[PDB]
Design a protein around this ligand. Structure first.
Ligand SMILES: CN1C(=O)c2ccccc2NC(=O)[C@@H]1Cc1ccccc1
Ligand SMILES: O=C(O)CCC(=O)C(=O)O
Ligand SMILES: [Fe+3]
Length: 287
């Protein structure tokens, strides 16, 4: 049984129901190739200078990722394509509002480019969020997913170059005794395609077997606004913030947030008023 493949335009309403049922779907042409090109060009130098995940100069080293992984997050100050095109993706927002409506507003838990060096080994099969949000393990097993992960190919995903592994249905597994690479299927994808999984989907990056190809992806973990993002936009220059849409501002933590509770009293408010109202935060002011 293979990962279902859906069109970003044609099949839009089918995407989240497909993930909710099977734990994974491939969104074909999630980002256009022109956006992929621009993202790539804009993040390239930051990828090249990024040290190892656990670099000694970091005061929050990532000890989990392999030394042949590079991960660059807080993309808004680096990439116009990301902060305009990606953060405003209609497809992305329709899926997130489909996924998160029971909880409320959602935001970017982390937007990162990952680049894997040739011969990068397969990651251990895993669910996300367990090195950041242990609260998630305490959720009842039937609780709606509180985060999801769009793994967007910025270069080709093939079985040979380490395309992601997923276990279909594994987001509903309580008993993990059956986890093995035996149960996986691959996300074979063209640049701009996205693999969409939930925080309970068991998955892993694949083994890069060519010894030559450098695989790159954009991972967008979207999560309910009641959960703290893994990354901070607090240091993004205010001019950059004020060039965004209000929606993009909210996604980066530069706006207040709402839950779905009928009498919701809000998140990140100030004596009854929003961040953006208190600070008189402008939007869509070009640089
Ligand atoms: C550790 N880890 C990340 O760094 C990561 C990277 C991109 C997007 C999400 C994310 N969150 C995570 O929880 C993963 C978990 C993991 C990663 C590699 C091997 C085993 C487990
Ligand atoms: O490399 C991949 O395709 C998967 C990345 C991943 O699962 C993670 O880093 O949490
Ligand atoms: Fe993962």
């Amino acid at each position: 049984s293979q990962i279902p493949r859906l069109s970003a335009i044609n099949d839009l309403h089918k995407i989240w129901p497909t993930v909710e049922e099977h734990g994974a779907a491939i969104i074909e042409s999630f980002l256009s190739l022109d956006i992929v090109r621009r993202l790539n060009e804009e993040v390239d130098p930051f990828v090249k200078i990024e040290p190892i995940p656990a670099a000694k100069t970091k005061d929050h080293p990532n000890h989990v990722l392999s030394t042949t992984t590079r991960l660059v997050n807080v993309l808004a100050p680096i990439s116009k394509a990301y902060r305009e095109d990606v953060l405003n993706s209609k497809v992305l927002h329709r899926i997130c509002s489909d996924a998160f409506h029971v909880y409320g507003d959602y935001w970017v838990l982390m937007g990162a480019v990952m680049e894997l060096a040739p011969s990068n080994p397969a990651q251990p099969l895993h669910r996300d969020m367990r090195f950041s949000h242990p609260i998630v393990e305490y959720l009842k097993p039937d609780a709606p997913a509180t985060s999801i992960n769009f793994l967007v190919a910025l270069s080709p995903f093939t079985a040979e170059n380490g395309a992601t592994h997923v276990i279909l249905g594994s987001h509903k597994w309580q008993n993990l005794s059956n986890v093995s690479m035996d149960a996986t299927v691959r996300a074979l994808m063209n640049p701009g395609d996205a693999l969409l999984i939930t925080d309970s989907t068991i998955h892993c990056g694949g083994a890069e077997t060519t010894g030559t190809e450098t695989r790159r992806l954009l991972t967008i973990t979207m999560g309910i606004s009641q959960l703290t993002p893994l990354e901070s936009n607090l240091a993004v220059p205010r001019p950059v913030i004020e060039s965004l849409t209000p929606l993009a501002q909210r996604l980066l933590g530069w706006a207040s947030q709402r839950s779905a509770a009928p009498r919701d009293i809000g998140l990140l408010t100030i004596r009854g008023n929003s961040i953006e109202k208190t600070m008189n935060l402008k939007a869509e002011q070009p640089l």
